[model samples]
Target: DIVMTQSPSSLSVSAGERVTMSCKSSQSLLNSGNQKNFLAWYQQKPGQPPKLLIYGASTRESGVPDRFTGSGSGTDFTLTISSVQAEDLAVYYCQNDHSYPLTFGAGTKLELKR
Candidate 1:
């Protein structure tokens, strides 16, 4: 069982910028019974809904752009965008699915840098 937390409540970046966000859990996300890290990442842009970007920690979802990536195990994890595009402006979230009461991070909002 764990609770997730995200850092940098908001970020400002220009196009082509590389960004990294962090997600930490109160306990290891590894599900000992399944031997898998039950974690997922999401992106939510304005006027739309949150879309799954990554799961099983580092596995990207189908059709997700290569710019997005996830990595890490146990209590610390990271979500990175190698080169952010204007269309990538959104709030990012990390979720844990190792047990009941699935939890999510507070979210990190991305804004265009002036």
Candidate 2:
């Protein structure tokens, strides 16, 4: 079992701005043989269910905007929003799917910057 640690518990940003956060795993989520990281990210908005933003650490879910990027590997990972939008405000989370009972990180909340 691995633990996922996410940073910037919360932040306020304006539309069209860039937002980024980090996620560290208790151990390498990378599969040496396959060169893949079994990590995923989710975005949850007020009163709505979580939306899968990324999987395999860098692969975006279908229809996800290009502005939303997932990068990094090994024991560390990153989620970057190159251009934040009004609809982008939400709680973001990272998960290590390397083992059973997937481990999740403490979500980071994004608030509108006046």
Candidate 3:
């Protein structure tokens, strides 16, 4: 029911640089069973919209670069961008696909620092 969104609007990083973004949910996503948080991360490369990066909070999707990662849980979470590349220019979003009314962050853009 609740939702989450990103901040800072955008970021500028050079090749091999690192960037980080934060995501906050409108309510707790802590599952009652295992108590694990229900959350996911995604990347929107340039013209593309978005692509799944992580799920279930920390499970990195296949084929995703080691430079991208999602961490944390509940209402507080993070998305880390490591060693940015020229081809890494994009927006990053976080979502909760654990149940209905899937929600996504507004996204933060990754651009050249120069």
Q: Best candidate, lDDT-wise?
A: 2
Error of 1 at 25 (Å): 0.6
The candidate maximizing TM-score is 2
TM-score of each: 0.93, 0.96, 0.89
Please list the C-alpha lDDT of all candidates, in the order they appear: 0.89, 0.92, 0.82
**RMSD (Å) of each candidate, 1 decimal:** 1.3, 0.8, 1.5
For candidate 1, write residues 1-78 as lDDT tens digits. Answer: 468999889999988989999999898888778777889998999988889899999999899989998999888999
Runs off by more than 4 Å, candidate 2:
none
> Which pairs in model 1 have colliding backbones?
none
Candidate 2's TM-score: 0.96
Between prediction 2 and prediction 3, the one with superior lDDT is 2
Candidate 1, after superposition: displacement of residue 11 in Å? 0.5
| lDDT at position 105, candidate 2 | 94
The residue pairs found clashing in candidate 2 are: none
Q: In candidate 3, which residue pairs get closer than 3 Å at backbone N, Cα or C atoms, i.e. clash?
A: none
User: Residue 107 in candidate 2 has what lDDT?
Assistant: 94
